[PDB]
Amino acid sequence: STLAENAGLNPISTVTELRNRHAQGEKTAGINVRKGGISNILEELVVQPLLVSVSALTLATETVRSILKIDDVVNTR
Amino acid sequence: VILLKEGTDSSQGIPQLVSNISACQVIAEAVRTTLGPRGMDKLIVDGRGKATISNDGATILKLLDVVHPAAKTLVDIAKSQDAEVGDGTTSVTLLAAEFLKQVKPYVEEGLHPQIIIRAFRTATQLAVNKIKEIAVTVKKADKVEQRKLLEKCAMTALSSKLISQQKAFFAKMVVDAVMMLDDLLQLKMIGIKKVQGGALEDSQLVAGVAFKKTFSYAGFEMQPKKYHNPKIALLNVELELKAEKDNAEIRVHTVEDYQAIVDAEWNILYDKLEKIHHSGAKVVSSKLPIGDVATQYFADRDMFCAGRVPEEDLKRTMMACGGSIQTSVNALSADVLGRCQVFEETQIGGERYNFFTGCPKAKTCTFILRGGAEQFMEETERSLHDAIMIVRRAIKNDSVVAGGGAIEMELSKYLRDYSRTIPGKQQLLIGAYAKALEIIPRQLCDNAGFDATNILNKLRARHAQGGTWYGVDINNEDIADNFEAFVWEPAMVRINALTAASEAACLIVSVDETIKNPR
Amino acid sequence: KDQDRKSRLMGLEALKSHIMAAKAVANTMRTSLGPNGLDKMMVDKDGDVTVTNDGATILSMMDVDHQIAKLMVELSKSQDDEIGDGTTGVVVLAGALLEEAEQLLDRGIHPIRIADGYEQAARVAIEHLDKISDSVLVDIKDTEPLIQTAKTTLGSKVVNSCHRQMAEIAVNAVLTVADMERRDVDFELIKVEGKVGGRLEDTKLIKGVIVDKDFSHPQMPKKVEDAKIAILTCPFEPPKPKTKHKLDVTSVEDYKALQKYEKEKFEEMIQQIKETGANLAICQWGFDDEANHLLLQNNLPAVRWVGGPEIELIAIATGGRIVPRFSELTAEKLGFAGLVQEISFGTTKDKMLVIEQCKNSRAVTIFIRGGNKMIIEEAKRSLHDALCVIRNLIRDNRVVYGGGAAEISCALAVSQEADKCPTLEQYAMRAFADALEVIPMALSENSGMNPIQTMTEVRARQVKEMNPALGIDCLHKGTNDMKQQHVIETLIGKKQQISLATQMVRMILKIDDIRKPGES
């Protein structure tokens, strides 16, 4: 929805349309900012490695779990 | 000490016009979201706390009664459009405020108001000429019967509604109810009644007047429900035994005198009952309830009786039968008594519904709705009233144009391309007149929850390539040929909207100062 | 006129303000949902004090001056005639849908688009309920389980002390006025009345008409077999008026004449009972002891001191006619009945007039007795649920399992079908699923349990453990699967519950301006 907003598209209808294309299709459906709309990203040759998406969820969730476990902060001296 | 005004508040020049332009937009905002069939409703509360919910632009302006001077100009202009047509008040109200908004920055830049008036008077006549040249007459297109085309226009308003699966039945009920009337057609004549429960297809269409008939007093196995040429009596008399209108109360000690009091109590009611019998009334009815004792008199004398009838249904039968609702039973005679051809008591949904068919002045009828709740009928009630007007409009005026803002975008192309060839100050104004027409297809997209940008850009691009009827589709979020889709409106009604809009904006633009007698 | 101090607010600030009012009406009633619902202390304008958890009674007394809240009350006024039971479920579901809609307005959805989304999901839910429905009295007229299911719902109200005797009474009433074959019952013919005294077990079903009036003499026949019912306004004696006597004698010459009219008219009027052949003489004003003498020798029953409207009620049921004067007496105007009797309620000498037709008539009434007026009224509305329950059971044998099993099953179907909605209504369809879960989530909260842990555990059991729907154990019985607990609601009930709730949400979402002129 942030990519769709930056590409001038509607943030809701873009992800709302893609959630149906993923239920019916595969992960090839994604936002193409070069053309300004939804397209088959597998054909556009716009890919990224797997470690970026995996390490993102891994490190982000650990930070959220760490922030969630903060009950309070103490000021020492 | 010695001043000129002394309470006389007055301002003149550009600030007065700009103040009236902003005040006119307030009236637009009050009726901006109600544009179209799927427009948002408006809740209005009177002084007594009674609520009023309605999405009709004309009904909203009547209840506001805004005290601003410039706002009253639009309201009186819109009210006249309602009396003359009954539709298009919102289009006139929005276009007027939009003509005023587009020329607002030019007024601030020192452009004279009179130069603006020459543009509206010029652009209006060019637009009215473009409508008649591009308009199309549809009377027997494709060798199709008028009953079938009007069915398409009726279901168009009823499409994607709560009765979409059975709109084929409901579409015929509109064409049937309109065709039943004489040459003089009117929306008020064809009444509608609501009956909770039952399937949607069970909605009945009575040719005459119909009502719930809550009269459940005694009188069964008598009072024949069929009459050939009955003398129908319409009254407002309460013939109940334990009645507050007809009773006696005398208190003495002589028991022999009570023999006269209790008997004279009924003799008073008999003189009123006998006056109905002598008058020749066969199908007697009244607004007030009628007791079991009275029904026995009608039974012993072979007379029909059905009370507790609403005054609207009685007066609807008054204009249908051609009688008169006489309060007192003393003046009941042939002067007030009505007539009918065929009367019969039916069993719609189990309850009895009286109705006179084939009355002498039968210019009215009634449509009984059926559904699983009131909102199924109320939402259906709103859409059918416009469906009657759509069928009523197509037969009257054969020349029509594409609705949904399709004609507004065509004029925007003609006036904008025409303004370029017009050197002078009229160029920016005729172009400003063109952009003001965008509000009609714009708010139909905004009120329908669509993206006005993607539609207007895709719509304005289609008109450039050759489109003339493409417009806004409230059902599908895309453009569609509103002419092929049978979304039509009368060209002369649309012509009167632009004229009243420019004439309303010209009255505000031509004004420069407001004067107020101190009172 | 009166443009000064006029209400003016529109946009999201107005819709959120309207949603804020509906939530207050829902949150006020969300706690009173179910048998474990928290009561509401209502103080009347007259200074009375009452306590109950009836959703309908809460809304009638709740005089909310906000206009959006008044529409929520007008909605429930119609629900009492269609569903009967889940009046709180409609308001609680509407508040849930509006609360979830507020999350969508921030995302940038239009109110009319949310209105279309809920209408699409409401059809998916209504379609799913018929799939998980079950019949009771299919292809056979039976009275045993019809008494059982209606008896379960009544156990929550004040009729719990004698809940079993009420269910059998509600069956014979509907069975009398209406036929199970035609399956078109008329709730208007099933009246309701009561009187303080006795106990709940003393409730009776009168196949006909009942008026709390006694014979003219205790020695009259306790059972009138003859079908000759003469109805009058004056009694068969020296006539008196219907309003007031005001005895003020003038002299003795007049008074001694009154003594003559006694012997002259007491015999003549009662002889008219024999000339026409009347047996049960109903009349507005009562008889003196003199007429009782003549009535007793010839076995002439007669009622005394009948009210104004009470006279008309008997003529409609018995099919008689009112004879306002003795000159109008005749055989055709006499009522008809199979057997009229006098029910003396034990030590209490009530002596109520019981005119019965000795068959299944088209008019019945359930007279609820009780030792407390507060328990009778709450018992009167308890029985009102059984009527609409039995009315919908006969009109449609299909029923679904209550306890929130239907709402959880519908939420799963709506959630799956939401993926097949390629448009902005997809966010609204998901919101309808979460809003459906507030009814079961409310029963768990009112029962003193973790709502979310009990919500998801039942939903997972509806998929992982077993596919058939399972409810919530709010009464702390053995376990879930309300089918074993015999807690089942009408299919017409749930269909109208979520339909009326959606219709109210669309009506509120399509309002963005409440204009009211102020006083200047």
Ligand SMILES: Nc1ncnc2c1ncn2[C@@H]1O[C@H](COP(=O)(O)OP(=O)(O)O)[C@@H](O)[C@H]1O
């Ligand atoms: N089925 C439809 N499809 C598209 N546009 C429609 C449809 N019905 C009405 N409209 C548009 O709605 C506008 C307002 O219609 P109406 O309510 O009759 O007039 P007003 O809003 O002035 O009372 C018209 O300009 C018309 O083009």
Ligand SMILES: Nc1ncnc2c1ncn2[C@@H]1O[C@H](COP(=O)(O)OP(=O)(O)O)[C@@H](O)[C@H]1O
């Ligand atoms: N014995 C029961 N066991 C489990 N759930 C019940 C039982 N009785 C009622 N409920 C639930 O409580 C809710 C409200 O029931 P009821 O009190 O009849 O309606 P309302 O709360 O609107 O008056 C229903 O949705 C139903 O699922």
